[PDB]
Symmetry: D3
Subunit: 260 residues, 6 copies
């Protein structure tokens, strides 16, 4: 449909990369309900697009996303939150099977940091900044900022960031494992598209299974994660792509995956 | 009046409660008496409405060199079990207000664990962390095999616990055990500044945030997120959340009231 | 025993370190069923060897282990995998109570990375490279590559490694916590043996308790991990070594452990 | 204008939303269309401020005999995986208001799982529960090996799942799969009575309680108790908890306002 | 100490059973702060008492405990709850190592049901009634009523009880596994004391290990519960009592436990 | 050449593998030798393509009276630890084919645990279950404090483990420890009939179902459901599923080939 808050584009070789750009620079991409509703539509679209194997989520040079919309939350009451299931469409990105890479340029604060962390991989621009300034507004992170952050960065830094609201640089974020790669502000999105391309080249069904396996590292004990992983591993043998990728390795040729 | 520790209220408007382990002749080894006082001091700052965060530190040479070996020396397994040995050691984990550990020098054995029990660890340039319990024929007994591993990774945790080797302030920060390194001289001052920032925020909200972050080690991500959302919703039941958000919108400085 | 694929040696002071070396350089130490069956034999032997307190696993200078043997997997179906418990003897190393240190020189890819990660400690040579290229073959990691990697390195790098098949250097691996030490290619195994030697010097029973305690960090909530740890800690008081090690500190002398 | 189901608002002040699976010719086998409508009805009652509890039932002979086998028949593994097969099935688990299953007759396979997805199960005297998926060369795919096991124990769950054998209303109740058995004739009426009692209580508190009870299957007891305590504290942020407790103290009937 | 709300007594053979009776019949034993403070003092006392091997907690014939004190909660705010750690001393009973058996006669509602559930074993009088009427007061159970109840009784009955506030009889409670034995109103406490007697006859250190093992069934996966149990099992071999209990079976005589 | 057990291939088509503990002199007390053979027999039936389900039983008077006390009597703490005491005991839990325990008479200590390690338990009218380890100065060491608690509830488990008391076949069934009670004489025959039903179905699917049910004790419901769904999708990769579903549609008997 026609978008008010975001710009979607199909990029990369064979237009296998679905680029989603948050376009609400006036509010530093603050995540209002309408922006979220469109972002989710775009995600579902790329998800249903057979040509797209990976999605790249980004904002502007100055801000990936400054957080949830404070103006929209200001008049909410506890009872509203509860009965109105406040923020329940926020984590839809986590239902997408295809990989999503966040190309974070500038500010990724509050709900913005959380949106980036909801993504599978995070690439950061040289000037990017991450933070959970919710405490400064008399609230706490509400979409995984006390969970995903802690799991990536450690208790000490997570506590420090969540309790003070202080920002960390692209560097601190990479050193801490919040993000895996840092690129120049200008080449960042291009670089993230390159990474999405490699992933898109691979089998879609296998990639989906791999992503589901990695995610499970945060939902079970190591014993059970390893067992689930083994079960998915066994499942790959039920696809043609596995046959194709293994035979191509043996046959020392290039594999022609067909996402089946 | 304490024998083993020195307490002080610092920070802007005396919002930071400083606890300093003071048993330098034993390199702040954690004897029963020291722990009993530490817990008293913690409970006090916990109950003091002017204090929003606590900073725990030791000396320049040692934060804490470990449990008191001499006091464990003649203990038996039935003594340990029945006497619930070391049960008062993790009282610090019951404190709702944030505790920041300003680790200068040695933070070994029970000292490393005490630091890790804290919410945030700041380390002096000359700080050293380690779990030498294995060298004594014992293993870490207050989270040294647990909080260490969760912060530093299996390989380094195993290496530290199985050999008893120490890591530097730098290795500790690179690994995520500590989040900041500061010069030996300005370390406590720097930790107090961090504590001040925290005390300036709404105590009730800060307590909820800390509880949320801690939950990252007690549940699956799905449940952690759900708990988090419930606390997030709860913040809307406070005056501070209303204030904090209207202030943003009204382009003004929020005035929190811990309510 | 008489080994086709590996070389075992008892090294270190008092021959306390059991050295196991993958020796199938033509396949760059690719893990075939036979290699695994021997690896497990060697492991069990060193495990039952009272003189051995720690084991060091290594491969060649060019490769620790470049992956499972694809030819061997190439013709399996899903039902074969399932009914035949494919790869089930792969994680036997995880049943060994004595510490295992992996001295990774060169490639540690696929099944090789997983095997290294199954070890308690990982030391890496300067030219070491880690990676999970399974996705390139139309399959996913099947021996903890999506689990132990994620738990050591974080979601962003793990997803990136597993979804693209890209390799990371020894430095990236150390920065991220996958490995705890990096040493020159030449002195690596020697350095790992020193580490195992240090560990063998301690009481075996206590060391086995410690290792079991650390591993529990990936199988329980922190509350339960801390309670199990406390129970093992109490158990150490039931041994003679605990007494000896504590008296020795008090008495200002060297402890004389007896593994009891 | 539903093809496969019949919705009705019942109970005092039409507080109960009654959904009736109406596809008797197929014994209410859960086809995609039936599920799409069920989900529509659920979401509607969910959004209806007049409704506080939902009662889901089928016919006298069958609550639901399972997924539509003919619709599953030509599916491949790639279809199942890539097509997120059965993902719209557990939508009922996202409804905040309580759902009570009034199971009359057969509740087999996908039908047993649908009933187990509900918060409370009332069973008619002639009701039968079972997981016959094994007889079709497949296993339960919507919680039949999970919710069943947690309610009935390993031995009976393994037996039912591995042989495909049915258990009676009595066995189900004795096992804790269902909490009440009623005559075939008065079953739905009795389930509506229960839903009525629920609807008279504060909606917000009822949603909190249901969320707390469900957490018993997603966390350790320690964490469940902590989450529960936090929801407990949250109830104090509502007008209804004030009302409820004052009414006790003032010796009067409480008037809840779902706020 | 000087108890206002409870009556303590040491009963049974050798006065091994420490009896605690809630004695505030005018408020049907409602759990006011003072009653809880005394209950905890009495528990700690029996806990520190060498002659007591088990505790039996009971109320009056009409009510075990009708719930928390509504009058005391009435004026509480969300902020009071949070900041004041409301109900913090409520589950101190769960820190007691010696077994506690609840002899429930009459009403065991709200905080009263939860208190009984915090106990290790629950014996119920023929006229006992259990329930969680918190919902009728505009609140939910706040000391395990949504947790321990569900785990003992199943989702359907728990949901039904918690959402409607309906009570269940002694029989429904036993059938459901909430309570393991039902006895006549008049002989109930006597019967519970006999049970506490048997327990007090065994080794206290072993009994504490066993209770801690069973409790772990609600805090871990079956894999880890089994491992923890095995570790406690091994620990029993570090005691004299195990030596004694096993030799006595072999020697076909009576075991003489000395609690170590 | 089994000293302690009797194995037999029963059931239609000799699809049921019966293992009989045969050490009545010591009421089938589980000695190391007995266990080593039990494990061999299990592995054999596991590798036997004609066998689809195993039935484990003892004598009329006792299934198994516990671990051998004489053998444990001189063990030390270091023995247990370093020697991995009782490590081969739960090998039965590695068998992927369903195992049904036909418990007649005593099933105490290690005996109860062994029965509980089985997937399904059928009990003779005179059967008795218990965990008397406490009477010997020890605690259950092979899941008696775990599987018991999970099937029977905390109150009964605590009572059984802390007092050493026995419960009857009826108490066991009422509590869900066992799913069926049969006359002492017809018990094994009845268990074989069950094992036969299981053996009739696809072995691959049955193994997936059993693994799914077992997962109910190793994860949160969310994850259990997700794992279950993945196995469910996997069944579509088998020929048996296609067959089982065609048979229904085609109103004919399914002919499974275990793949
Ligand atoms: C569950 C949750 O997850 C909840 C949350 O995230 S809520 C809180 C998290 N986010 C925040 O607190 C960030 C607040 N924003 C800031 O601190 C600053 O915008 C900044 C430091 C990021 C940038 O500073 P700056 O360069 O001076 O830009 P700034 O003028 O503030 O913002 C530009 C515009 O975007 C708006 N904006 C920025 N962040 C916003 C937000 N989170 N919500 C709504 N509007 C926002 C600004 O108000 C301004 O609009 P107007 O002047 O027309 O009102
Ligand atoms: C459950 C648990 O968690 C258990 C544990 O932590 S116990 C093990 C952890 N701690 C240890 O192993 C302590 C090791 N200590 C040391 O190696 C050294 O004290 C050190 C490396 C920290 C510093 O070295 P140093 O500058 O040469 O100081 P050093 O002379 O050795 O010690 C100074 C004084 O403090 C005492 N001390 C240091 N650590 C101690 C401890 N953990 N317990 C008791 N006394 C201790 C020393 O014995 C000495 O006192 P005395 O001379 O009166 O006997
Ligand atoms: C993820 C999942 O969880 C998936 C699923 O549950 S798989 C489904 C599990 N269910 C089964 O295996 C089949 C259950 N049904 C039966 O066994 C029998 O219908 C019954 C025992 C319920 C009743 O037997 P019955 O009284 O003799 O009636 P019966 O003739 O078999 O069936 C009634 C009609 O509804 C159809 N029907 C029954 N169960 C159905 C199902 N699960 N799906 C689709 N149609 C079904 C029947 O085919 C028949 O229609 P037709 O005569 O036009 O062909
Ligand atoms: C975290 C939590 O878990 C919190 C809680 O449980 S909150 C609420 C749970 N408990 C309840 O709802 C109990 C309410 N009580 C009742 O419904 C009834 O007392 C009963 C059904 C138990 C018995 O009815 P009854 O025989 O007519 O006795 P009743 O007159 O109501 O009560 C006897 C006296 O004890 C008081 N009492 C009973 N239950 C009480 C409670 N939970 N708190 C405080 N006082 C209570 C009564 O108010 C009355 O005192 P007064 O007449 O002097 O005011
Ligand atoms: C890790 C673990 O999980 C460990 C274990 O379970 S610990 C063991 C738990 N089992 C027990 O405590 C043993 C219980 N057994 C007995 O008390 C009785 O045998 C019984 C109550 C089962 C039945 O009573 P009974 O019919 O009168 O038989 P009884 O005369 O006592 O015993 C019959 C024979 O089998 C032996 N026996 C019974 N149970 C045994 C056991 N668990 N271990 C070893 N031998 C046992 C008896 O010693 C006797 O052998 P001998 O006469 O040749 O010396």
């Amino acid at each position: 449909a026609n978008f008010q808050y975001i710009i979607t584009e199909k990029k990369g070789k064979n237009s296998s990369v679905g680029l989603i750009q948050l376009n609400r620079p006036k509010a530093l991409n603050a995540l209002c309900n309408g922006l979220i509703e469109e972002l989710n539509q775009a995600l579902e679209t790329f998800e249903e697009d057979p040509a797209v194997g990976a999605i790249v989520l980004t904002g502007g040079e100055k801000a990936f996303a400054a957080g949830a919309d404070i103006k929209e939350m200001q008049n909410r009451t506890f009872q509203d939150c509860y009965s109105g299931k406040f923020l329940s469409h926020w984590d839809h990105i986590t239902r997408i099977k295809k990989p999503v890479i966040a190309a974070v340029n500038g500010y990724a604060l509050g709900g913005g940091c959380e949106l980036a962390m909801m993504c599978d991989i995070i690439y950061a621009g040289e000037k990017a900044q991450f933070g959970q300034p919710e405490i400064l507004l008399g609230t706490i992170p509400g979409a995984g900022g006390t969970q995903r952050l802690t799991r990536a960065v450690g208790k000490s830094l997570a506590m420090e960031m969540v309790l003070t609201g202080d920002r960390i640089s692209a560097q601190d974020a990479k050193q801490a494992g919040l993000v895996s790669k840092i690129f120049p502000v200008e080449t960042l999105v291009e670089e993230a598209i390159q990474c999405a391309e490699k992933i898109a080249n691979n089998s879609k069904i296998i990639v989906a299974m791999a992503k589901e396996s990695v995610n499970a590292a945060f939902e079970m004990t190591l014993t059970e994660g390893n067992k689930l992983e083994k079960k998915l591993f066994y499942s790959t043998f039920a696809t043609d792509d596995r046959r194709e990728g293994m035979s191509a390795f043996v046959e020392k040729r290039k594999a022609n995956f067909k996402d089946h």
